[PDB]
Amino acid sequence: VGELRDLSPDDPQVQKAAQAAVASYNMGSNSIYYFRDTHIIKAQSQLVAGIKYFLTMEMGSTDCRKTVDLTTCPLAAGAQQEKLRCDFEVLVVPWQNSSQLLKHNCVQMLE
Amino acid sequence: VGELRDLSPDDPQVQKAAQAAVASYNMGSNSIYYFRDTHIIKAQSQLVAGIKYFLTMEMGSTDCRKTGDHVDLTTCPLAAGAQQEKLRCDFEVLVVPWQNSSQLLKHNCVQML
């Protein structure tokens, strides 16, 4: 992790990263219409390192609703509590306070 | 990009990453209830290097609708008039050369006039 070098909007790798950013946004979007890149204003790149963690973990539903301390929310009880087996992929860089969830894949289990 | 080493479910850094993962899923999830971690089965860690790109860019709505995917935005003309919408977005993209793909990490898009 170093400080970002400024780049040319026309840099071919910048353009590759732009196209990727658009594609993922459109997959994410809540618009029916696809979106397209017009102009690229500011482009910067940083060099980065981090650890990627690969978790397989079981999670249970608590009773608390979303509209925060999860320790104080006790799990649901019996057939009412739904359990999940999830494979997570988390990325931690030393600079960020945050860590990012990259891929997650969850599946329900039987009683 | 290196090999995953298996680690202890109780490793404090593993615990911090589980905590992070849960929070992220909870914001993402389509459940009404928050979820909580019970048991940690398998934990592995991999070392990673790549470049992060920080784009600020303007995007327009095209006429192509949604009803990976097989899209050439080159073939999709921007909208005219009623369907017009312009966005100014700050993206953060991560590219690792070992992997082929790139990942969008943070995006913040804002409508324009």
Residue numbers in the entry:
A (entry chain B): 10 to 76, 83 to 126
B (entry chain A): 10 to 76, 80 to 125
Describing publication, verbatim:
Cystatins are inhibitors specifically controlling the activity of cysteine proteases. The cystatin superfamily shares a common fold that is characterized by a 5-stranded antiparallel β-sheet that is enwrapping a central α-helix. Because of its strict specificity for cleaving after asparagine residues, it is synonymously referred to as the asparaginyl-endopeptidase (AEP)2 (15, 16). This strict preference is exploited by the legumain-inhibitory cystatins C, E, and F, which use a conserved Asn39 residue, localized on a reactive center loop different from the papain-inhibitory site to specifically bind to the legumain active site. Cystatin E is the most potent physiologic legumain inhibitor, binding 100-fold more tightly as compared with cystatin C. Thereby, it is associated with a tumor suppressor function in prostate cancer, melanoma, and oral carcinoma cells.
From a structural perspective, the hCE dimer was assembled from two hCE monomer conformers that are connected via their L1 loops. Analysis with PDBePISA and PDBsum revealed that the hCE dimer interface is built up by 45 hydrogen bonds, 361 nonbonded contacts, and two charge-driven interactions. This results in a buried surface area of the dimer interface of 6710 Å2 and an interface area of ∼3354 Å2. Furthermore, the free energy of complex dissociation, ΔGdiss, of 55.4 kcal/m indicates that the dimer is thermodynamically stable. Remarkably, we discovered the assembly of two hCE dimers to a tetramer. Nevertheless, the overall assembly (nearly parallel β2-β3 strands) is similar between stefin B, cystatin C, and cystatin E and therefore suggests a conserved mechanism of oligomerization. The dimers interact via hydrophobic contacts involving residues of the former L1 loops. Despite this large structural rearrangement, the local conformations of the legumain RCL and LEL were virtually identical in monomeric and dimeric hCE structures. The crystal structure of dimeric hCE uncovered two symmetric and functional legumain-binding sites, either of which is accessible for legumain binding. Upon dimerization, the L1 loop, which is essential for binding to the papain S1′ site, was incorporated into the newly formed βII-βIII sheet. Thus, loop L1 is not available for binding anymore, and the papain-inhibitory site is destroyed by the dimer interface.
